[PDB]
Copies of this chain bind each other. A is one copy, B any other.
Amino acid sequence: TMKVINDPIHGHIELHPLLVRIIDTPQFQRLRYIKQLGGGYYVFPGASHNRFEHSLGVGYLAGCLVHALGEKQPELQISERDVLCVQIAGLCRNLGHGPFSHMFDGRFIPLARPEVKWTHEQGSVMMFEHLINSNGIKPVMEQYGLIPEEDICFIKEQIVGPLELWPYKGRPENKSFLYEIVSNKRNGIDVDKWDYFARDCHHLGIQNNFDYKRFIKFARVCEVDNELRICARDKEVGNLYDMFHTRNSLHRRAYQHKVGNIIDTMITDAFLKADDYIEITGAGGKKYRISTAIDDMEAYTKLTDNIFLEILYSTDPKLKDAREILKQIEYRNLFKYVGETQPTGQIKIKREDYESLPKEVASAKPKVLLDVKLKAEDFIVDVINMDYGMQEKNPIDHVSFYCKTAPNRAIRITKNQVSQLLPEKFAEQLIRVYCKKVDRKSLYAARQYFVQWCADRNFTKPQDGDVIAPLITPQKKEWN
């Protein structure tokens, strides 16, 4: 029968036996050894938390919302079967994450396997399939009134979207709102965010501005374009803008911390240098690399943060280079942050250009006296796309509301109906430059290149420009 778990974020959470069964598998328990925030623990020591607990919380919130909708509106005809499918999807959407979470799919795979297109979402689905099959979960699903054919499909669609008009098969348009819960492809407002806001804040020691419980109390389902969608009370629109403001602020302060990112980068580099020599045993004894473990779920199951220590503790001279990089992390001899800047006006930077940017910085020729001359390979340039989840688009334009005088009647609210104190744009890029040569003279030089390059490209003046490169900044009129 049902279990109770004490979670510091949510208190006592009840788990249905079916969910317990899913949880007590190697594929799920693997998430215990994967840090939610990856390299962020190396900056924010409270951030020891792993994907496992986050996943329970997501499962629980998914349950809270679907339950609340069913209580408020019986006409929806939400079944226990629906509830469990939504919960399982909530529990299982993080299944696909790799070592150090976003470091894996954000940095390492793109560089190690550039041709392949891969996301932790893709992986969550494959791992789910693997989990089910390796553990005879299908019978248990039937025992609790689930129909594996339909429901497994439903659960996967919740995580990844349509597997291919109504494009979903797992449930009909009348249950369209169930898709908005775990992973909302329309506007990003889902229970996953709500868990991580609260859980990350509790651990980082930052405080969360967003009340998900309030939002759940005001959520209704209404008809919109012959779909039944989740609608929010009109007056809660400010709170939603704040939700995304909060999300952006958490990225600025924590998830994109300049040092957090460089640590991610260093770990990535070490993984690249270990990739040829590290072997992980997949299906039938067969052997995979860190970069190919994504092709066999049996191998992927064993790919966790542990890899980092396997490398750190290795004695194989093949891994000397990789191991050396991790040692510099332990001694805190890190690549050195040089500065930050942004593009100007319409200028935007594409992914294909990323590899050429170190070369551009090294090519800048500042009119200054330098001991050392620096090369492209000495520079790291991290480009960070900050948005409200939908590139240039405003996600509140993709949200439906209702008012208290007509609760069944969905409506739209424009930005101009809310406030003038809101953002005019919803996307931007940050450029961080770091130097792999750490000494005073290399660093002094690196700053001159950097600031010169900013001036050459008509980027924004680094905040400390006048202090670090006083001989460069005067040339640019706009800057002073």
Contacts and interface: CB of A to CB of B under 8 A. Distances in A.
Interface of A: 4-9, 11-12, 14, 20, 24-26, 29, 32-33, 41, 44-46, 48-50, 52-53, 56, 202-211, 213-214, 217-218, 234-235, 237-239, 242, 245-246, 248-249, 252-253, 280-281, 285, 302, 304, 306, 309-310, 313, 315, 327, 330-332, 342, 386, 388, 401, 403-406, 409, 411, 413, 416-417, 419-428, 460-464, 466-468
B411 A420 contact: no
B14 A217 contact: yes
B421 A8 contact: no
A204 B403 contact: no
Contacts of A213: 11-12
Contacts of A422: 423
Nearest to A41: B32
A332 B46 CA distance: 28
Contact of A7 (B46, B252, B406): B46
Which 5 pairs show the lowest CB-CB distances between chains A and B? A8-B205, A403-B464, A8-B46, A24-B332, A306-B309
A234 B11 contact: no
Contacts of A202: 8, 202
Given A234-B464, A242-B249, A309-B306, A205 B48 contact: no
A285 B462 CA distance: 49
A252 B46 CA distance: 25
A332 to B, nearest CB: 4
Given A238-B252, A310-B310, A421-B426, 12 more contacts: A6-B204, A12-B211, A24-B332, A207-B207, A207-B211, A280-B313, A306-B306, A386-B419, A386-B421, A403-B464, A405-B464, A411-B463
24 contacts: A4-B217, A7-B46, A8-B46, A11-B205, A12-B214, A24-B331, A26-B327, A29-B330, A32-B41, A48-B53, A206-B211, A207-B210, A237-B463, A238-B249, A248-B421, A306-B306, A306-B310, A388-B421, A401-B463, A403-B468, A405-B468, A406-B467, A417-B461, A417-B463
A299 to B, nearest CB: 10
Contact of A463 (B234, B246, B248): B234
Contacts of A56: 45
Contacts of A409: 467
Contacts of A309: 33, 304, 306
Contacts of A342: 420
Contacts of A209: 207, 209, 246, 249
B411 A421 contact: no
Contacts of A33: 309
A446 to B, nearest CB: 13
Contacts of A252: 238
Contact of A5 (B32, B45, B302): B45
Q: Most chain-B CB neighbours within 10 Å: which of A24, A44, A48?
A: A48
B423 A428 contact: no
Nearest to A249: B242
A44 to B, nearest CB: 6
A283 to B, nearest CB: 13
A464 to B, nearest CB: 4
A218 B12 CA distance: 10
B53 A46 contact: yes
